[PDB]
Design a protein around this ligand. Sequence first.
Ligand SMILES: CC(=O)SCCNC(=O)CCNC(=O)[C@H](O)C(C)(C)COP(=O)(O)OP(=O)(O)OC[C@H]1O[C@@H](n2cnc3c(N)ncnc32)[C@H](O)[C@@H]1OP(=O)(O)O
Lengths: 62, 188, 49, 149, 312, 39, 417
Amino acid sequence: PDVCVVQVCDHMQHDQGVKRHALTITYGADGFQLRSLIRRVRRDLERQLSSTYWQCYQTNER
Amino acid sequence: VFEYILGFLRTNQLNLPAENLQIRAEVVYSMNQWGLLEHAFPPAVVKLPDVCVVQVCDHMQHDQGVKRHALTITYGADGFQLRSLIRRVRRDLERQLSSTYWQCYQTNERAAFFVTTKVANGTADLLTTSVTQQLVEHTESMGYSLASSYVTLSPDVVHTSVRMLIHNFTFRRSRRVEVEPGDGIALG
Amino acid sequence: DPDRPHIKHIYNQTALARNLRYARYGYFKRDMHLLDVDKLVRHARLLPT
Amino acid sequence: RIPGTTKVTYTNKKGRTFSFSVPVSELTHPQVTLESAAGTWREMDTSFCELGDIEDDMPSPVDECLRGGSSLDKRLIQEVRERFVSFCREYVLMDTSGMKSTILSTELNAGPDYEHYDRRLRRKRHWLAIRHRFEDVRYVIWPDVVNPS
Amino acid sequence: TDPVRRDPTEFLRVLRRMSRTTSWQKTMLFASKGRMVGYRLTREHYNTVLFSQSLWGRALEIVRVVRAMQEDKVQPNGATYYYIVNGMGNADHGWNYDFRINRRLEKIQHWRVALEALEACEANGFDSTDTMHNSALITLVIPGFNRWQQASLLLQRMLREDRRMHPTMVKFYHDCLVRNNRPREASSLMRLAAERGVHGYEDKWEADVYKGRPLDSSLMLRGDQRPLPENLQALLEEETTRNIEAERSVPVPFSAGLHATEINSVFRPRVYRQLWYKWQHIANRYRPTAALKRRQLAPRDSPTGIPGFYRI
Amino acid sequence: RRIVKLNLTSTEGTQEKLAAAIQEHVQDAYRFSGPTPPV
Amino acid sequence: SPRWLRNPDELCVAALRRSRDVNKINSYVATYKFDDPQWAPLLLPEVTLISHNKMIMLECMSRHVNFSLRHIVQKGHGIYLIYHAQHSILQPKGLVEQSFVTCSFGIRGERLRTDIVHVGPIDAADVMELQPSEGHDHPRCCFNLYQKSDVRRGVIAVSQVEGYGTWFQRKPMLWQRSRRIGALQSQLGAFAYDLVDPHEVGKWRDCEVSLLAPHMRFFRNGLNGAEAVGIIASSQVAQQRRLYLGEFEAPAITALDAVQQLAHASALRCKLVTPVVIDMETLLPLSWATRTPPPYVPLEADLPFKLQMSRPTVFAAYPTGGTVGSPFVRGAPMMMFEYNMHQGVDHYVYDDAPSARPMKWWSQKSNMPYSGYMYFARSGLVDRFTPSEDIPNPLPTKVVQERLRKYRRKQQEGHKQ
Ligand SMILES: CC(=O)SCCNC(=O)CCNC(=O)[C@H](O)C(C)(C)COP(=O)(O)OP(=O)(O)OC[C@H]1O[C@@H](n2cnc3c(N)ncnc32)[C@H](O)[C@@H]1OP(=O)(O)O
C-alpha cells in the first residue's frame, strides 16, 4: 500500500512483584517481510541482554 | 539537474540538495551515467543511523511529600557521545539545581543517568526542561533534526505512588551534501 | 577426625546434640567408596562380624 | 574530537572508482555487558592488604620496596633501611596488653579465629615477617665485606 | 538434590534476597560455598555480594570479593567500583573509652584500595561518581587515619573535574586538618565549602589570614613588626622551635594520646540503627540512640521490635 | 547444635567428602529462603 | 554435517519384512539404512589411513531392531526399555548386509526376547574400493553392498536382546533421578578434568578420549582390576563423528566405548597388547554382554561416572556358558573383562533432624547404568582363529484367473447399458 499503519501495543503486567511486559507489532498490509525485522531485533538485542530475559518471534504474517 | 551538473563543472564543487531527494537522486544518476561523479567525489568505529529514537524517562518519587528525581536518558542506536552530553547537562544544572545533592554520569553506552535528592516543584520543572534542551542540542549537533516527539506521564506498573514522565524524541539524519551509502541504489 | 580431633571431646550426651548414635557403621555405609577401613574398624560402634 | 564522517572507495558496475561518505562515530564506553573475558581490562593491586591468611606473610613497606628493581640505588638503600628499622621498632614497642598465646585445640586446622586475629595471631605473624624480610634485606643493608651507601 | 533449589536461577534469586533483606555474612557464606560447590558465579552475583558488603562497610570482605573476581577473571562494570569505593568509605572506625574500634583497619589500607578502585575504573573507561570520589577522600581522612596531603590532591582533582563536595566529606576533612595542625587548609576548605554552597556550610565562610603567603620555599609578621637583626632573629627562632616542641612533648592526662577530634569518636555505618541503604548517604554515622524510646515504641513488658538498637 | 560427624575417609576420598559437606552446607543455607513453588 | 544428538524416536533400520512361512511368522528380515550418510558411518566400518570394530554397529543394529519390534509387546504401555544385549561374533572380519530376527516372549509374559542372526560379507577387503575419485586430498570411500556373485557370504554375528515394555514408575525414575543429577552436579567440583593421551589408551585422536587421567587407579599394576572416572562430554561427542547423544542420556554404544577404552589401557598395563612406546594395536571385541538392572535409569552423559573392572583372564568350558554371549571362535588368546559402572552420589546425605525421615527423601544410590562382560582379541591375531561351530545361513494363478473372469463380466456388461 501507499500508506501503511503499524500498531505497537505494549501490555504491562506484574505478579508477586515481578513486572513483565509484552510488545505486539502489527502491520496493516501483508507485503512486508517481518522475519527480517525479527532477525534485526534479535541481532540488536543479543548484545544488549541475554535471551533468558526476553524473547521475540513471529506470531503470524505481519 | 543539468544546472547542478554544469555548476559543478564550472566550479569544481558539487553540493547535493538535501530537501528534494528526487532532484538529488536524479543528479546522482545523471553524473554516474556520465562518469563525472568519480571526479566529483574522488577516492571502534560505528555508523550513525538515519533515524534515531531517544528518550528521557525520569521517576519522581516522594520522600516527605516533596519529590526526588531519578532521570535517565536512552538512545536507540550506538555511537552518540553520552559522556559529552552529560558534561554539558551538568554544566547547565550546576547553576539551577538547589537540591541537597545531585549527580550525573554515563551508566553505559547509549544511556546516561542523573539522581537528585528531594527537589521542589519549580526546581524539578527547571531540571527537566534543561535536560531535554541539552539532549536536543546535543543530538542535533551530530547531524540530526527532530522529526517528531511525544510526551507521557503515567504511574509505575508496580508502585502507584511512583510517577514517571517520559519525553520520546525522534530525529531524522539530515543527509549530508555528499554521496553516501544506501544512496547507491540511485546510481545505475 | 577421630585420630587428631580439633575439638576437646568428640562426643557428648546433651539432650538435643547427642552424637554417639551416629558413630554406628550403618551411617558410614552411605560413603563406602571413600572409606578408610582401619579407621572404620577403630571408631565405628555397632560393627558386624 | 570525533571526525563525524569517513570516506569509502566504491567501484561502480562499469569499473570506475569514486568516494562515498559514511557518517560514523567512535565508541566511548566499554562493552562490558557481554560475559566475555577479554583479558585486557586493568586490575586492582591487592598485594598490600593484610588479611588473616596464614599461608601468606604480613605485608610490609619493605615488601613494596623490594620489587625486584635495580637495588643499586643509594636512595632506595636508605629507604629500605629506614623502613626495616621502623618495622623492627614496631614489633619491639608493640602494645601487648591483650595478647594471649594459649594452645587452643579449636585452631588446629585453622589460624586463630577471625575475631582473635589481633590478640593471638598478630605478634606471631609480625615476628615471622621480620625474620623473612631479614633474609631478604640483610645483604642489602649490611653488605658483605669486599663508597658505601 | 531438588533441581528447583539447585538452579543457577534459584541460587541467584536467594542471593538477591539475602542481599536485599539480611546482613552481610549471609551473602558471604552463601556465595563462597556455592562457588566452591560448582555454581559458576558471574558479575551480577559479585555485584549482589558487593552491594551488601558495601552497605555494611566491610573493607576486608570487599577485598576478598575483589580477589575472588580477579581469580575468576570476571570484569567489573562500574557498579562494582561504585560499591567498592562506597563500602571502603563507610567502614567501622574510631574510638570508645580508650578502646580503638576496628584497629584491624590500619593494615588493610582500605584508603589505597579505594584509590586503586577509582584508578581502575577510570583506566577501564567508566564514569566515576562524585560520591565515589567523596567516599575515597573520607577513606583517606577517617578519624583514625591522617592522610591529608593525599586527600588535598584528591580534592584538587575533584574540583578540576567539577564534582560536588559532600557535607560529610567536608566535616571529616576539616576535622582531620585541625587534628593535623593545618589552619591554612582548614580555612581554605571552609571558604570553598561556603562558596560552593554545600548545605551544611553556608555561614562558615571566614577571612583568609594567609593572603599573599608562600606554601614552600618563613616568618609571619603583622605589618607593625620588623624582623630582628638576623644574628638575633636566628637565636629567637632557635628558642621558639625549642619552646614549641617542649610544649608539644608533654603528655595530656586523662586522655589516651588521643586528639580531641577523635576522643569519643565511634563510627558504625548507617544500617546499624534500624535504617537501610540510600545513595546520598556515603559515610553516614549511625543515628543517635535518643531517636527511639522503648516505652514510646511499645508498652511495658512487651518487645519493641528493634533488636540491636541502643548498642554501641 | 548440629551433630558432629566423624570423617572416616582415605587420603583420596577427602576431595569428594569435602564437596558433599559443602553441598550440605549450601542446602542448610537454602533453608534461609521460603518454601519453593521460553528457551 | 554432524548429528551428534539423535532423538530416541528415530532408528537406523528400514521397514522389516515378515516371512510368509507359517512356522516363520516370528521371523523378520531387516534392511538397514545405508543410504543415509547419517547412519552410514555407524552402519559401516570405519577406515583407517580398517579397524575391525563391530560393537559400534552390532549393538546399534540389534537395539534398534528390538526398538522397532517393541510394538508387539508394548501393548500400549507408557515406556519401552531394552536390556540384556548379548553378542557373539563368528567372524571378526567382514561387514553386514541384513539380519534375520526371531522374536518370542522369553520367560515372562511381560518382556520380548529377540534373536538376531547377521548375514553379509565375511570379508570387507573384497568389497573395499580404495581412493575412488579422491579429488580433495581425502578420498570418499564407497562399498558395494548387494553384489551378484563376486562375494562369499555367511553368518557373521548372532545377538539377542530383550525389552520390558512397562510403565513409568514415578518414584525410581522421576524424583530420585531428579535428586541424583543435582547431587552429581554438586559433586562436579571434586574431580580434576584432565584427559589422557590416547596412544596408551587405544584411540587415535585426542578428540574421542573420555577417561580422566588423574582419576585412573590400578591394583597391582592392573593385575587385580582397575577403576577410572570418566565423562562422556557433549564437547567430545560433538566434534567426534562416530557416536551421538540424546537429549540428556548417553546411549549404550557411547557407554561401552569407555569400557573398551579402559580395557585397552588395562591390557597395556597387563602386557596383553603391544603398546605404542608405528601402528596401533587396538584390541577388538568378539563377544560381549551388557545388562541394566532395575531401576532401568539411563546413563547420564554430562555428569561423570566411575567404571570398575575385573582382572583380565587370558583364555589360551567358559565361565559364562555356551549360549549367545560367549565367544563362538577358538584359537588365538582372548581377554575377559567383567565391568560395572556407577553414575551417582551414594555418599551425600542431609540429616536435618532425627524426627523427620531424611533418608527416605534425600538418600539415594549410585545406579548401575550398564554392567556386563567383554571378550577381546589382540588386533594382530584377528586372522589367527576361525569360527568353531557351524550355523546355517538363513536364505498366484487362481487369483489372476478370478480377476480376469471379473473383468470379462464387467467389459461384457458395459455394452448392454
Ligand atoms: C579487632 C577488631 O576491631 S575487628 C572489627 C570488625 N570485625 C568484627 O567486629 C568481628 C566480626 N566477625 C565476623 O564477621 C566473622 O568472624 C567473619 C568475618 C569470619 C565472617 O566471615 P564468613 O561468613 O565466615 O565468610 P567465609 O566463611 O566465606 O570465609 C572467608 C573465605 O572465603 C574465601 N573466598 C573465596 N572467594 C570468596 C568470595 N567471593 N567471597 C567471599 N569469600 C570468598 C576466602 O578466600 C576465605 O578463605 P578462608 O576460609 O581461608 O578464610
